[PDB]
Amino acid sequence: TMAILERISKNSQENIDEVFTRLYRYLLRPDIYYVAYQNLYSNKGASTKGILDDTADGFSEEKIKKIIQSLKDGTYYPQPVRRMYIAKKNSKKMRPLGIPTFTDKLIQEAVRIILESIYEPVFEDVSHGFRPQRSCHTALKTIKREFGGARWFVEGDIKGCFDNIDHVTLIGLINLKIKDMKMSQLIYKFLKAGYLENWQYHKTYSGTPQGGILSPLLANIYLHELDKFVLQLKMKFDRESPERITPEKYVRYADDFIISVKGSKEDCQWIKEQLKLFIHNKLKMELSEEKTLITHSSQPARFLGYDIRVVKKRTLNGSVELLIPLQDKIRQFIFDKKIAIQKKDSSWFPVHRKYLIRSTDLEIITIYNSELRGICNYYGLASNFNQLNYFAYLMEYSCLKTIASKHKGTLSKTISMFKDGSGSWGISQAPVLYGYARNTLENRLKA
Template sequence: MSTTLRYAEYYDVPKLFDDLYQRSKNNATKGINLYKHIISKENILLAYRNIKANTGSKTEGTDGITIDHYKMENVGSFVDNIRNALVDYKPNTVRRVEIPKPNGKKRPLGIPTMRDRLIQQMFKQVLEPICEAKFYKYSYGFRPNRSTHHAMARCQFLMNRGGYSHVVDIDIQGFFDNVNHSKLLKQLYNIGVTDRKVLTIISKMLKAPIKGKGIPTKGTPQGGILSPLLSNVVLNYLD
């Protein structure tokens, strides 16, 4: 009997991620076939596991599908379908929702379909170690194993040991909605993501049509799994 996704084993891929991190640290990522790692069976199944563990897995995209749709699917078929979707990748239309902000305004969120969330998670898992190796040591937003508590501890340290007594609070208005796509792709290349096929697919992700809005020419929508990592690539130069 074939294995279904519900019973698929967790595939351990930290060794690959550690290797990518070290190679990025040593500026040795040029020429790596990142796409091969992204579409590996192990990385695809890990993406499924990570998505399934997130409460957002119950949130529907424009196609009405949640993670439950995949639970009883055959592992081989699931992996093949995801790989086939990337051969000539066309992202599905993004569902747009607005959530209230404390100031009374609304924050737009883009909810990709479950298939596209899985694909974004696959990309994130492979690209994150490369980017993490180059990110500024003292930035804390949207990063693994870091939180506001770490940022507060750093502030406390600077106050106690460094003699600092002032904090600057800056908000970049409409940041996510105004990211320049061309500059972002160049920044990804410069940080170590040099696989042209990967960059081409990310470019397509950025131009995923938004329901009721059309095809965006700038920005990386809040709500996308890859968006926080991409935003940190842009902001790393500011840090």
């Protein structure tokens, strides 16, 4: 079992100071242990979790390994490796998976380990937030609309998290709250094995077929620990930046950034210099276009998919700042998903879906609907209904033109306007399309 790793991270040579916490995880320390014994050591067969939405086929130990895996069944566990990353259908912090080896079922538990290890008192917002809470896309609304009484949001381009992975100070940091000074080593002899194959003998990965569940949280540690070190100067940075523009809370994602608080471009040079120093020194990656693209006040320019202002024109601001659903993406997949054409003026138009021959009709409406519902979270807290309403008109008339050009009678757009949908009152029926669409608009937006 993982009893080794139990004795490893639990014990952690605690005769002098030890695994991360120093006053606040003593009677909260075995909090993990008791239940990792019951959850991360769920059971010895097919038990913990897996990939058929709970776990794969039901074998006996998990198949045979973990009990004696103390004796390192897959000792080296070479785990052949290539690269992979998929453009997440919007606002991609593109997420990594691992080439299929049901050692998968090993690493998933092996990293529920690390999840419960660091996250429990410390590591905040698994998979791209900043502050600690128990949800995915919540800081990236609330902290945005929490403070920010300033201008000059500083975007970020270079990855530094994946195409610059350390692999030396990587472990050097990983073992700063897991393994101890004395008698703790037995983990990473395979963690080091992102042996990518692109005509070289690299150890660096771009997707670490070692596993996909963890590479998010590995990257998250990569950034998360040392964001404290780089925040240590932020800890005195806002002497007057909050209080210079005044007279009448970092921004940590997986990938992209902006400095929290601004008072001056001279108050911004400190960013421009230090946040380049540390990232250079520690991360072994360096940033782009001279700290970046520093907007004077505002732009219709992206950030994690969300603009911030500090006929596609309904923005606001004032004494207080806010959020806005910008253009780019709904110029990008608005056009690649074959919603619009601009090649007739009167800017865009619902013309139809790409396919001449298309799938079934419940299929059509359902995949269209899920596409829309794609708005439901991403385009949550947002101004600019009428923009989205242009979007929605094009989308709806696209789905109706689609089910039209499938029936294909006499420009079946009219008879399909009339025969089902949301006014024909009909299974040939799905009355959720667009009222629920402006429902998803109104809420998660004003609440």
